[PDB]
């Protein structure tokens, strides 16, 4: 018989990471791994065994190349002409918290379980949080 | 290459402060400061500055030459100072100064008022000729470019703001 994970008895820990000086494509992948629980032996496809991850200094994320001017983020409102276009620097200046969220949501599976995994990311834009009551552990990338 | 290898002499009465890669120069005209690219190294021989390309950078000699030229400009501006003259040409055109601003009537309905940075000193010895003095070269070049843009010298009669040392490729209208 193969062991499975029960959502009631599973445990989740709190980790805090600073996104200063690291890349989106090499940080969001680790975040998705630790959100899906692929770093634990108790990994199961249908159970969210991941850990609650907090991200600090999302505006300090480092990106190489000319992506700061050529990295567009297309989306559609729903209307016929409701198409919008932005760039990396505009996103950082206006809504910096929505630059890690897009990457992690794209990397995570699509569905209710993926949304539940995404619900655990407490992405902030500074160097301080209000979740000190959870006693988080500092993590390196 | 050759420019970078050519050294920079700092004359008497000039004080140099080098913290990290940042460079600050003080003296007679004023104080200047400028940071350089992380692909160059600057050394002081107690009487002359030298520049060297660092390891791990392909475009090192070009950056060193640019830094040498910038430091030479800074030291000569601090010691003597940069100057530039504008020879306004055209009927009905004049110039005036009020403290640190420039007033012009370049054939416009409204008078043209232009501000100046804190390190620029202007003078109008003649109605059709003005002069400016400063410590930096890029600032005075930008100021002259703005003055030139106000009234571009036309290729038919030369009316407009033009440099006192440049030339105009004037033409003649057909019949």
């Amino acid at each position: 018989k193969t062991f499975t994970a029960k959502p009631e008895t599973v445990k989740r820990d709190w980790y805090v990471v600073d996104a200063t000086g690291k890349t989106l494509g090499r940080l969001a992948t680790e975040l998705a791994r630790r959100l899906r629980g692929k770093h634990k032996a108790e990994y199961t496809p249908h159970v969210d065994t991941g850990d609650y991850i907090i991200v600090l200094n999302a505006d300090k994320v480092a990106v190489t190349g000319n992506k700061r001017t050529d990295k567009v983020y297309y989306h559609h409102t729903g209307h016929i002409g409701g198409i919008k276009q932005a760039t990396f620097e505009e996103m950082i200046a206006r809504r910096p918290e929505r630059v890690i969220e897009i990457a992690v949501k794209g990397m995570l599976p699509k569905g209710p379980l993926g949304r539940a995994m995404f619900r655990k990311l407490k992405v902030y834009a500074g160097n301080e949080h209000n979740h000190a009551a959870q006693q988080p552990q500092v993590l390196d990338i | 290459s050759r420019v970078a290898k050519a050294p920079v002499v700092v004359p008497a009465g000039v004080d140099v402060k080098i913290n990290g890669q940042v460079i600050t120069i003080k003296g007679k005209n004023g104080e200047l400061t400028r940071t350089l690219n992380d692909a160059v190294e600057v050394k002081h021989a107690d009487n002359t500055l030298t520049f060297g390309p660092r390891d791990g950078y392909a475009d090192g000699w070009a950056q060193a030459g640019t830094a040498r030229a910038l430091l030479n400009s800074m030291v000569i501006g601090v010691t003597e100072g940069f100057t530039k003259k504008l020879q306004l040409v055209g009927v009905g055109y004049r110039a005036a100064v009020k403290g640190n601003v420039i007033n012009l009537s370049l054939g416009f309905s409204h008078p043209v008022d232009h501000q100046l940075p804190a390190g620029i000193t202007a003078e109008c010895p003649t109605q059709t000729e003005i002069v400016l003095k400063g410590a930096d070269k890029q600032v005075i070049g930008q100021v002259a470019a703005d003055l030139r843009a106000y009234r571009r010298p036309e290729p038919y009669k030369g009316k407009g703001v033009r440099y006192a040392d440049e030339v105009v490729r004037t033409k003649e209208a057909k019949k």
């Binding site: 729903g78 209307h79 016929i80 409701g82 | -």
Partner: protein
Amino acid sequence: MIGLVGKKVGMTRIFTEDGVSIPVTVIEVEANRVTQVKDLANDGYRAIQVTTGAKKANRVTKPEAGHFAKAGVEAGRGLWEFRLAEGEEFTVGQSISVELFADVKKVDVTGTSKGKGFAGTVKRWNFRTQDATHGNSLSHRVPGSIGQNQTPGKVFKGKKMAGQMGNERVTVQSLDVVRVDAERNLLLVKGAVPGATGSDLIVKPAVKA
């Protein structure tokens, strides 16, 4: 800038010695009392809420009565809110008057328009009408077509068709003020303001002018 809340009474005219009959919509702006001041520390923005008029003691609810008693203000007929700028301060017990617009020339009036009910396309979006003759059948006032055949094969979002027309908040800017009567608590504004007589309107200094 700090606006005020008034009650629309009707439209009329005012004559000038030059021989001009300027239209005007008289607005009755009573003593507008302060109920609460919101600061940047607690609420996150600088604003002030205003109460106008009077209400029945047997009709005002207990939470409203307590909120008014916290300030020391009688029970009005409603609550409005206005944002604040730098250099503008107030207290909780103040009662602003119509004299604030003494040096104001152009104002903006915001209010709920008059409800026209479920209106047709022609009345709602100023559409045109097909011919009433030459063979037309049951399509004298219909909007006609809505889209294209199987490309996209649907209806675009934001299409203009029939629906509710009225009972919505509209703002008219740059209306010229004619006169201010502090004794009668009256404001004279040239033009036409949205809403029927007796409605509540918000008069503010012009944002652009």
